[PDB]
């Protein structure tokens, strides 16, 4: 039964309810829910509209004429806004969406991430991994899920943050820390058999220091399944010295046994 009807308090296109079937812990409130990245010191993002590369398309940007598709290598979105099956889910390309300088309309085919959350998610209490996020609907492969949103900080600032549970490297490298300011993505756990992947995306600016992180499903996800991505070795090289992976996959790379084995 529902504890919070929407932890995003109306900030997303859809609500994100919270439940806890495990204990009496309230839904987390030790952070500020924000729907777009914030700054707590000057970031100097290049917002100059004349610095944008942009297309001159007169259609829905599904043709070879689209510069933005070419910047992305090709436009990877199909007619339904899902990544093409051909999309490299292992080493994802940079995506350049259309922007305010393009001649196309706001409803062209190359604007998926900038249109926000469309799928139904739930914040819930897991057995062994704290809070997590799961699907309340079927999510076909290649579907945009949500953005990793948080506080933009420098690499140097990131290295002195006390809590390093929510740091996402963007690459003079910058980092998103979702510890104090974050969205639903801050609750997505690590899975060694993941069903979503993060992808670097450019939308309203093309300052390469500041890609935005978009999660897409990498396979069909069924109702009730926990969402998770592979946090990567720059996370686990450090974290594996303090706790072990509880994802429970027979392919788990960071389990107690896997860690003991490598240390031996």
């Amino acid at each position: 039964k529902i504890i919070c009807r929407d932890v995003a308090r109306g900030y997303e296109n859809v609500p994100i309810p919270c439940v806890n079937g495990v204990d009496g812990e309230p839904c987390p409130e030790d952070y500020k829910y924000i729907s777009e990245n914030c700054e707590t010191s000057t970031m100097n993002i290049d917002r100059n509209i004349t610095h944008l590369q942009h297309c001159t398309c007169v259609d829905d940007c599904s043709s070879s004429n689209c510069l933005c598709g070419q910047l992305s290598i090709r436009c990877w979105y199909d007619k339904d806004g899902r990544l093409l099956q051909e999309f490299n889910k292992i080493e994802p390309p940079l995506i350049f969406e259309c922007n305010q300088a393009c001649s196309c309309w706001r409803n062209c085919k190359n604007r998926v991430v900038q249109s926000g959350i469309k799928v139904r998610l739930q914040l819930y209490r897991t057995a062994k991994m704290g809070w997590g996020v799961r699907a309340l609907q079927t999510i076909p492969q290649g579907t945009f899920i949500c953005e990793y949103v948080g506080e933009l900080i420098s690499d140097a600032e990131a290295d002195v943050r006390e809590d390093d549970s929510y740091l996402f490297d963007l690459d003079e490298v910058y980092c998103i820390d979702a510890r104090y300011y974050g969205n639903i993505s801050r609750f997505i756990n690590h899975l060694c058999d993941p069903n979503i992947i993060p992808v670097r995306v450019f939308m309203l600016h093309q300052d390469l220091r500041f890609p935005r992180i978009a999660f897409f499903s990498s396979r069909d996800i069924r109702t009730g399944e926990e969402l998770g991505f592979d946090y990567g070795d720059r996370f686990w090289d450090i974290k594996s010295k303090y706790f072990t992976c509880q994802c429970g996959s027979e392919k788990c790379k960071h389990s107690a046994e896997a860690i003991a084995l490598e240390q031996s």
Binding site: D159, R161, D164, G232, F235
Partner: peptide, 9 residues
């Protein structure tokens, strides 16, 4: 090698 854990693409 950094001081803190970082998730990454």
């Amino acid at each position: 090698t950094k001081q803190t854990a970082r998730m990454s693409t």
